[PDB]
Design a protein around this ligand. Structure first.
Ligand SMILES: CN(C)c1ccc(C(=C2C=CC(=[N+](C)C)C=C2)c2ccc(N(C)C)cc2)cc1
Ligand SMILES: [Cl-]
Lengths: 184, 184
């Protein structure tokens, strides 16, 4: 049970302070000693990796549960995926702030990145058919993920702060994202 | 005149802890004592608007430098405007994070928004000529500026961390921004 309390606490501290969040802070917010956090996670980088995989699985499980297989137009399908991404972030603001900082941290291992793609393999396929070539490359995929997350978090933030127009920010955000990242 | 130090400390502190104003810390790093402060500034709101108008001034003054005369193309001018925003942001990380924070407080007056937009009349006019009209409406103006800034900040993060490819990130980021926000 302590491992979960550690993830939860790290989720919260990283959302507010990014990866520079203190391990001593995370341990006590979880109700455990820092020395115990390091028995679960030998390094802070190992914590970073496990937390990313944990938040990732949760996000993908939530999107898969809303995935309508009847939708057959690519843009509509990506639109409903986006809505589902935004809705998860709106229901879990800290988990999304944390996942975004983790996702762009350069501390994720190759096994983590590799293991990350295989939770929703078809969503992954869908990208290689829509996304701009440059944003699929080894050099710039990470940047393309960063650009997508910045668009998403900004859409989440305006929807949260002015809910009367949530559905308008989310649709405008999607359209902006679609033009930014996808092929002609 | 010592008021310039309260603005320098406010930029940092704000850039370090959001619009939360440890006026104690402010005053201390600024030299001056506590109450010593609404003494230069009235309300915390006015300080925000003041600082904001102060940071925007610094940002415009840094660009007006890079500005040209011969360049005609609407896309080429926006490109220079974007290059300048990234340069200012990379050279002044505190200021840039201060200013994004101030713009999401909704505490800016329409006088401030007016005083800002008056600072660079060509920019105003360039947006009124290139940006999707939806993003120029009263309802969605701030959203469209939030998307631009999110894309610019992410471009900055990837540039700072990988200086070898910075020029490529800036270029990729511009083009994603331009498709996201300007006339089809
Ligand atoms: C002086 N210089 C280099 C500048 C000056 C201003 C900008 C722009 C800007 C910066 C900060 C803002 N806030 C603090 C709220 C709002 C807008 C901007 C410009 C164009 C644009 N579009 C083409 C969509 C969007 C934003 C960019 C470069
Ligand atoms: Cl405490």
């Amino acid at each position: 049970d302590k491992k979960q309390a550690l993830l939860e606490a790290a989720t919260q501290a990283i959302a507010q302070s990014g990866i520079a969040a203190s391990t001593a802070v995370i341990a006590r917010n979880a109700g455990v000693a820092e020395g115990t956090l390091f028995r679960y996670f030998a390094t802070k980088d190992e914590l970073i990796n496990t937390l990313y995989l944990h938040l990732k699985q949760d996000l993908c499980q939530s999107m898969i549960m809303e995935l309508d297989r009847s939708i057959t137009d690519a843009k509509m399908m990506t639109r409903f995926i986006w809505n589902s991404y935004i809705s998860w972030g709106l229901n879990h603001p800290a988990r999304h702030r944390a996942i975004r900082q983790l996702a762009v941290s350069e501390k994720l291992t190759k096994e983590t990145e590799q293991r990350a793609d295989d939770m929703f393999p078809e969503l992954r396929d869908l990208c290689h058919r829509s996304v701009l070539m440059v944003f699929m490359s080894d050099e710039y995929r990470a940047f393309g993920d960063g650009l997508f997350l910045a668009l998403a978090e900004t859409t989440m933030d305006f929807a949260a702060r002015d809910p009367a127009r949530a559905g308008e920010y989310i649709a405008l955000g999607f359209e902006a994202m679609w033009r930014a990242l996808t092929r002609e």
